[PDB]
Amino acid sequence: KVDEMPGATAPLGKFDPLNLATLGSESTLAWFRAAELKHSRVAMLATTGYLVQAAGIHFPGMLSSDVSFESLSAMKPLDAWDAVPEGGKNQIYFTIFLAEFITECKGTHYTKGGPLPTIVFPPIDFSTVNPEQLKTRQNRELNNGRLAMIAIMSFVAAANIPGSVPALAGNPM
Amino acid sequence: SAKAELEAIAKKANPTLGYYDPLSLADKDFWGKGNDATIAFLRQSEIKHGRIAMFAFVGYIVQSNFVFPWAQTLAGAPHPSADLSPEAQWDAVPLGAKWQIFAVISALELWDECGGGGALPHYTKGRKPGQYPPFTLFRDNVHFVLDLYDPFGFNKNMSEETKERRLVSELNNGRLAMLGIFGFLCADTIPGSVPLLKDIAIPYSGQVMQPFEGQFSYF
Amino acid sequence: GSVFDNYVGAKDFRGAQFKFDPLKLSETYEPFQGWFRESELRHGRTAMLAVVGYIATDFVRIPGEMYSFEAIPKSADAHDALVASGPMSQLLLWIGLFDLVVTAPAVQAMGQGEREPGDFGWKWFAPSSKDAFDKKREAELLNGRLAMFAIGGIATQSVLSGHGFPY
Amino acid sequence: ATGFEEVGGKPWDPLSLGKLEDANDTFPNMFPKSQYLQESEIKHGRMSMLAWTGVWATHVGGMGLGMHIPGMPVESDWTKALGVFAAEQPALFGAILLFISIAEGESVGHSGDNWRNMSTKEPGNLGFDWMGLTRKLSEEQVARYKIVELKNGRAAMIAMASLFAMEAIPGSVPIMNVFN
Ligand code: CLA
Numbered sequence: 005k006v007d008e009m010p011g012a013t014a015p016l017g018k019f020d021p022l023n024l025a026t027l028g029s030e031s032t033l034a035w036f037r038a039a040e041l042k043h044s045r046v047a048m049l050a051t052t053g054y055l056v057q058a059a060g061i062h063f064p065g066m067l068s069s070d071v072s073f074e075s076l077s078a079m080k081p082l083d084a085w086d087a088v089p090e091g092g093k094n095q096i097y098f099t100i101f102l103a104e105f106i107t108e109c110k111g112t113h114y115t116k117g118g119p120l121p122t123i124v125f126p127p128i129d130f131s132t133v134n135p136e137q138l139k140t141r142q143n144r145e146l147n148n149g150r151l152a153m154i155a156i157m158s159f160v161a162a163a164n165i166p167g168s169v170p171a172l173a174g175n176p177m
Numbered sequence: 178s179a180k181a182e183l184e185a186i187a188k189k190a191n192p193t194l195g196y197y198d199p200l201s202l203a204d205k206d207f208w209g210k211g212n213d214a215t216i217a218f219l220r221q222s223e224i225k226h227g228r229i230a231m232f233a234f235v236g237y238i239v240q241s242n243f244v245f246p247w248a249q250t251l252a253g254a255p256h257p258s259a260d261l262s263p264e265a266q267w268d269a270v271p272l273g274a275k276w277q278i279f280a281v282i283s284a285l286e287l288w289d290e291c292g293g294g295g296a297l298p299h300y301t302k303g304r305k306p307g308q309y310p311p312f313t314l315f316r317d318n319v320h321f322v323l324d325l326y327d328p329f330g331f332n333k334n335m336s337e338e339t340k341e342r343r344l345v346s347e348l349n350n351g352r353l354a355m356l357g358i359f360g361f362l363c364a365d366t367i368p369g370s371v372p373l374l375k376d377i378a379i380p381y382s383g384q385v386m387q388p389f390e391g392q393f394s395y396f
Numbered sequence: 397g398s399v400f401d402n403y404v405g406a407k408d409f410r411g412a413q414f415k416f417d418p419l420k421l422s423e424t425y426e427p428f429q430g431w432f433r434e435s436e437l438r439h440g441r442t443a444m445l446a447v448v449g450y451i452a453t454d455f456v457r458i459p460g461e462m463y464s465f466e467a468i469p470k471s472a473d474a475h476d477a478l479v480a481s482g483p484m485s486q487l488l489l490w491i492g493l494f495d496l497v498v499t500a501p502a503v504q505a506m507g508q509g510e511r512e513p514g515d516f517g518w519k520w521f522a523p524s525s526k527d528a529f530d531k532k533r534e535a536e537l538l539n540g541r542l543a544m545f546a547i548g549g550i551a552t553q554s555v556l557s558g559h560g561f562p563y
Numbered sequence: 564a565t566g567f568e569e570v571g572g573k574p575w576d577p578l579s580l581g582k583l584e585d586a587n588d589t590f591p592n593m594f595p596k597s598q599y600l601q602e603s604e605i606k607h608g609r610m611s612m613l614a615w616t617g618v619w620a621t622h623v624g625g626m627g628l629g630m631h632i633p634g635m636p637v638e639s640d641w642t643k644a645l646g647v648f649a650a651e652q653p654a655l656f657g658a659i660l661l662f663i664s665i666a667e668g669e670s671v672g673h674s675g676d677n678w679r680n681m682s683t684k685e686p687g688n689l690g691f692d693w694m695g696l697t698r699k700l701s702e703e704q705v706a707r708y709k710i711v712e713l714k715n716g717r718a719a720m721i722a723m724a725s726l727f728a729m730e731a732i733p734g735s736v737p738i739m740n741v742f743n
Pocket residue numbers: 384386387388389390391392393394395396
């Protein structure tokens with residue numbers, strides 16, 4: 005049921021014109037739920053990770069042995085991805101590769117009604133937090149991700165097609 | 178409960194103002210700890226910032242006024258100036274003497290938050306149902322009487338009808354001098370001198386949030 | 397088993413019960429509990445002397461050519477400019493010898509129950525009770541544990557800084 | 564959860580190698596008992612999990628890892644990397660070999676005969692539960708991580724057999740001609 009779900013706010017309510025929540029079973033909807041939950045958290049970190057990396061925040065010192073943080077007083081934030089060395093790019097994926105495991109190896113997987121993906125390290129005891137005010141936050145968490153999923157696509161389209169975005173094309177990136 | 182306990186003391190500080198909450202900050206988890214440790218931590222912080230505030234403003238006035246003459250350090254010892262900015266009298270404190278000011282605070286900040294013991298009584302409550310509390314036990318080590326907040330004891334003569342006139346006042350008393358800091362301490366950094374404020378610490382102080390003006394950096 | 401009601405020192409800086417056994421060492425290595433106490437008492441004593449022994453050496457120095465401030469500017473270097481000349485070989489010989497002829501028979505007598513751990517026979521000023529002797533034992537444990545962290549900081553910061561008494 | 568999920572829930576002993584020593588009366592104690600076969604499988608698995616990760620972490624370029632302790636010898640392949648290290652660092656190589664020699668001797672010195680079911684210890688139980696694990700966990704998890712250790716030991720033993728075959732038979736495993 006789309007009623008009783010965080011993510012249904014005031015200006016639209018149940019937003020499903022093409023009826024995709026009905027398209028599978030209840031296990032199907034739980035997969036799309038934590039997809040959008042995960043699509044949000046990647047896009048929120050990438051949108052915010054685009055705005056800085058563009059104003060010059062600049063970690064002091066050396067990233068690696070000879071490829072130190074000149075990647076910011078230089079090439080666009082969409083770049084500095086091949087400038088990061090391979091052993092540096094490798095440990096990023098593998099910390100993620102580890103983090104995708106505890107996410108999957110809980111006692112009850114979430115499409116069987118289990119909990120949503122939680123923090124891998126330092127997991128405070130969690131949302132023992134007043135479930136009325138818990139529902140307001142999961143609306144806040146998803147809506148900021150909804151806005152960030154659009155925004156990171158704006159940032160790619162501006163870096164590929166100049167003039168594809170009006171009040172944003174006059175920005176050095 | 179926790180929402181109901183502010184609205185009882187909302188309508189006592191100012192009945193025209195009443196319940197003040199547009200940013201909705203007193204109902205919600207900090208690091209993930211719940212509503213009952215939410216309000217009491219924010220009822221905590223609003224007065225710790227305010228207890229220093231009265232103690233800052235009285236501490237500001239007397240340093241703009243009559244300075245303290247003796248020998249301050251062991252060699253040389255001139256006592257930085259009288260008329261001069263307590264802002265940069267704080268920077269004209271020697272390097273050593275700022276650490277023991279900060280360390281005795283940390284001895285009192287270690288003191289405030291632990292919780293009652295498992296084999297001896299030493300500490301009071303923290304934020305689970307605790308109030309915004311004082312220190313109340315200064316006898317646990319080999320020391321003499323320098324009870325904190327209690328020099329010459331006598332506060333043993335008031336009841337629950339009369340203590341609410343002392344708690345809720347200091348709330349509002351601490352909010353005044355809190356604004357009394359930033360209303361003045363901006364007026365040295367900028368000109369603008371909120372109604373009129375002129376015969377003052379005449380340049381800006383120089384990074385009023387700095388504990389140490391010169392000696393050690395981080396790069 | 398359950399080392400905490402078998403010995404003493406389960407106390408923090410206050411004296412409230414602390415029970416510091418996170419890795420369950422005394423449960424997985426239960427026959428080594430006497431050795432664990434013996435070692436900790438040994439390390440603590442070594443540290444308490446080597447703290448005091450150290451940093452009180454930037455003030456005074458016994459007379460002599462090598463001892464009195466000549467070839468040895470600071471207190472921290474005093475190893476590997478003294479090892480070659482003899483006093484470190486001489487002080488290794490005795491601490492060695494002592495360890496090879498009496499404390500290895502001592503730790504043999506502990507494991508047979510013929511000796512309380514960390515005894516060595518220095519009963520000159522003991523309060524000679526049960527409540528008061530534990531308080532002296534605890535005061536030895538709580539001081540020795542602090543001296544281990546102490547010289548860990550003092551020996552590290554003196555190679556880094558190179559300064560006098562405040563390192 | 565059972566250890567047999569990939570072979571059909573049943574004990575995979577084709578060629579009946581655990582039943583030998585009991586089929587006939589003809590070699591009296593010349594084949595290993597169940598307790599000795601269980602420790603050999605755990606031990607071969609633990610050495611293979613370390614050795615695969617070793618040849619994987621020191622391979623430079625390709626997929627590779629190229630991580631290298633400063634001060635040690637730079638050697639490309641794992642095939643000759645022991646004998647270079649044995650000649651150049653005698654004190655470090657001798658201290659590792661003595662540590663392995665004592666711990667491996669202590670494994671059997673306190674317990675009985677393993678070759679015969681007379682050991683009085685669980686197979687694989689070296690006194691290395693320092694983290695205090697299995698004293699805090701419950702019995703379902705403790706029995707589970709044993710099977711986790713087993714199958715990961717088993718995946719690494721087959722890996723080490725692939726890693727041996729590719730250098731003795733140059734076209735043996737074809738998934739590594741490409742992978743390098
Ligand atoms: C309004 C929020 C705010 C802001 C913006 C800052 C900003 C800063 N804080 Mg700060 N702080 C704040 C609130 C804030 N604080 C609060 C609420 C606390 C809790 C009490 C602290 C506690 C705190 C500590 C404990 C320390 C800082 C320090 C610093 C500085 C760190 C960067 C640095 O080393 O630059 C360089 C430093 C400065 C620009 C300020 C001092 C300048 C001196 C005079 C030297 C200037 C010369 C040179 C050009 C710069 C440094 C060189 C070096 C060799 C000295 C920076 C200016 C650190 C600091 O300033 O140490 C030097 C430090 O140790 N903060």
